[PDB]
Amino acid sequence: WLLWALVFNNSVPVGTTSKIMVLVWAFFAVIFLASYTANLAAFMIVDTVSGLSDRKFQRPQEQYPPLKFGTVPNGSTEKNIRSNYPDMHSYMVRYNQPRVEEALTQLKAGKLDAFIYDAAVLNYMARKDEGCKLVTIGSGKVFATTGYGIALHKGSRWKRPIDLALLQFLGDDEIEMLERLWLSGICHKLDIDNMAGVFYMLL
Amino acid sequence: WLLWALVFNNSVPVGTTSKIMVLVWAFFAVIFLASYTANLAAFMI
Amino acid sequence: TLDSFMQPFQSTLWLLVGLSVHVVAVMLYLLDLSSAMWFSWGVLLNSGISARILGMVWAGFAMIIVASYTANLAAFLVLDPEERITGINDPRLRNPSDKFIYATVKQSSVDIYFRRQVE
Amino acid sequence: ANLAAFLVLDPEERITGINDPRLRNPSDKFIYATVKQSSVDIYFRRQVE
Amino acid sequence: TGELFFRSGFGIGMRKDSPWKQNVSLSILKSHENGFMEDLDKTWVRYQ
Amino acid sequence: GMMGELLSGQADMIVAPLTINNERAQYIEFSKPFKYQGLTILVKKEIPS
Numbered sequence: 001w002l003l004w005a006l007v008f009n010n011s012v013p014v015g016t017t018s019k020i021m022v023l024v025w026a027f028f029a030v031i032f033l034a035s036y037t038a039n040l041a042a043f044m045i046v047d048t049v050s051g052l053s054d055r056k057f058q059r060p061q062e063q064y065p066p067l068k069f070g071t072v073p074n075g076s077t078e079k080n081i082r083s084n085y086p087d088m089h090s091y092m093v094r095y096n097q098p099r100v101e102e103a104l105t106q107l108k109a110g111k112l113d114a115f116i117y118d119a120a121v122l123n124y125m126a127r128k129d130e131g132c133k134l135v136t137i138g139s140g141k142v143f144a145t146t147g148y149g150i151a152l153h154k155g156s157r158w159k160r161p162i163d164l165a166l167l168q169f170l171g172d173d174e175i176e177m178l179e180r181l182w183l184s185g186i187c188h189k190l191d192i193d194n195m196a197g198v199f200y201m202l203l
Numbered sequence: 204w205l206l207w208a209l210v211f212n213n214s215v216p217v218g219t220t221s222k223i224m225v226l227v228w229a230f231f232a233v234i235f236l237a238s239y240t241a242n243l244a245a246f247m248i
Numbered sequence: 249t250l251d252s253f254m255q256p257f258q259s260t261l262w263l264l265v266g267l268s269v270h271v272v273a274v275m276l277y278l279l280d281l282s283s284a285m286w287f288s289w290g291v292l293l294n295s296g297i298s299a300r301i302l303g304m305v306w307a308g309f310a311m312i313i314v315a316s317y318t319a320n321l322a323a324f325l326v327l328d329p330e331e332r333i334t335g336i337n338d339p340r341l342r343n344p345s346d347k348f349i350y351a352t353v354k355q356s357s358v359d360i361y362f363r364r365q366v367e
Numbered sequence: 368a369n370l371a372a373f374l375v376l377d378p379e380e381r382i383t384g385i386n387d388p389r390l391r392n393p394s395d396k397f398i399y400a401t402v403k404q405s406s407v408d409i410y411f412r413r414q415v416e
Numbered sequence: 417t418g419e420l421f422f423r424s425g426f427g428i429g430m431r432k433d434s435p436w437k438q439n440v441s442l443s444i445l446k447s448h449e450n451g452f453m454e455d456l457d458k459t460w461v462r463y464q
Numbered sequence: 465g466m467m468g469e470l471l472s473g474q475a476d477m478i479v480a481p482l483t484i485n486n487e488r489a490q491y492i493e494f495s496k497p498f499k500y501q502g503l504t505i506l507v508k509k510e511i512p513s
């Protein structure tokens with residue numbers, strides 16, 4: 001008598017006081033579907049790791065093995081790993097022996113999944129590189145943050161003035177200018193959604 | 204007999220080889236109106 | 249001019265839609281070409297013009313699904329380049345490389361200009 | 368269709384930084400301040416520009 | 417809003433010509449390497 | 465300020481979020497940094513229908 005045909009509302013071909021409210025509801029519904037595309041256009045127009053505490057890094061034996069993620073030995077990062085994580089060192093023999101560049105080349109060609117190095121050298125070999133290769137969530141992983149220094153003789157006379165001069169360069173933004181000059185880069189659901197929608201409609 | 208109803212094409216409720224091409228033309232037409240908004244959005248925005 | 253519908257739709261969406269439509273037509277025809285012909289004609293773009301009432305019920309549900317899928321396809325279609333360097337301090341020009349080649353007139357004012365700015 | 372195409376439409380908040388014209392050119396309309404007698408007061412006292 | 421400028425870090429102070437400088441700096445660096453500082457930052461700054 | 469207490473008053477260390485710059489390190493020895501940062505600007509986000 002009523003309701004069911006009205007409840008159909010927006011559909012294919014498929015009286016009394018009912019007709020007026022049915023027309024009003026149909027107008028509201030068609031306005032709603034018209035605005036559906038509007039909000040879709042307004043709204044419309046991702047990380048595989050979060051830290052060394054991840055199960056994959058912490059536990060070398062977890063399903064598939066990481067493809068020999070490694071680092072350049074004989075440095076600071078290697079000492080950090082060998083000291084604070086004396087379990088990663090056992091699963092670190094299959095590292096990239098040569099300097100950085102070979103590791104980047106191997107990473108591009110799916111040889112290894114992750115590279116752990118300095119946060120400035122590698123951050124440079126993440127923007128100058130063609131295409132785009134990204135670091136883990138920016139500088140959110142940065143572990144034991146320290147700074148590049150200027151080694152001096154133990155208790156030297158020049159330890160005091162150099163420091164002062166260096167601090168001056170931070171005040172006048174000269175170091176910022178040098179960083180901008182020498183460290184500038186340019187890098188800075190289809191089938192799945194279709195299957196999900198089909199399954200939802202079928203259910 | 205034909206043509207006029209087909210010429211109406213996108214509209215409100217209104218030989219054997221006519222139905223197939225009518226359906227094809229209707230599908231092309233609705234695709235065209237669907238892309239009308241697409242090109243409007245691309246050009247305007 | 250159009251040359252873009254294959255990117256978000258390709259063969260996958262077309263095959264999925266065709267398979268779903270044909271399976272639906274066969275199933276709801278059997279549980280009731282010929283009647284299936286116009287039943288499939290209903291499941292096409294918008295439309296072309298006890299057991300039976302609830303059959304119309306699931307047909308309406310499938311039509312809501314089809315309309316939603318068409319709306320999603322339209323929303324995916326609306327999409328949109330690059331052609332400009334930044335100037336004289338762009339990283340591409342700031343860092344020389346064999347990939348990018350730029351030159352000026354030899355022995356001209358530009359050669360004079362790029363010989364006093366040591367930086 | 369024209370109404371729907373007119374409907375789809377779309378802000379402002381962030382500044383540029385320390386060289387934005389609003390901050391570069393002082394005016395009574397815009398008021399910004401830092402902690403008195405702090406490191407920021409030291410910084411905005413050596414950059415003469 | 418904006419990007420960081422004048423990127424100079426914090427620091428424990430001490431009087432000029434004081435014997436605590438070397439040992440305090442050493443302890444701070446050892447804490448940085450040990451992961452203690454990361455844990456402290458997680459406890460008292462992040463996760464809000 | 466705090467520098468007054470440390471330099472001549474009743475103090476021996478200053479354990480506080482103290483920045484590092486040239487005008488401060490001349491008379492005060494600074495340990496190695498324990499957190500990195502930079503000056504930045506805070507503004508009120510615009511209310512959003």
Ligand SMILES: *[C@@H]1O[C@H](CO)[C@@H](O[C@@H]2O[C@H](CO)[C@@H](O)[C@H](O)[C@H]2NC(C)=O)[C@H](O)[C@H]1NC(C)=O
Pocket residue numbers: 073074097098
């Ligand atoms: C890292 O250090 C090891 C050990 O110091 C280096 O191994 C030496 O390599 C040189 C040159 O190939 C040999 O003459 C030595 O006999 C090696 N010693 C040992 C104990 O292996 C290794 O070459 C270094 N690697 C890098 C990249 O610096």
Ligand SMILES: *[C@@H]1O[C@H](CO)[C@@H](O[C@@H]2O[C@H](CO)[C@@H](O)[C@H](O)[C@H]2NC(C)=O)[C@H](O)[C@H]1NC(C)=O
Pocket residue numbers: 435436439
């Ligand atoms: C800095 O710390 C080191 C290690 O904790 C101190 O080195 C020892 O200090 C004790 C007591 O002052 C001496 O008896 C030892 O001879 C020192 N050396 C060693 C190897 O134990 C050092 O004294 C501290 N310095 C200051 C100024 O506190």
Ligand SMILES: N[C@@H](CCC(=O)O)C(=O)O
Pocket residue numbers: 072073074075076077078118
């Ligand atoms: N800055 C690092 C570079 C890489 C390494 O040596 O491990 C260092 O000299 O320790």
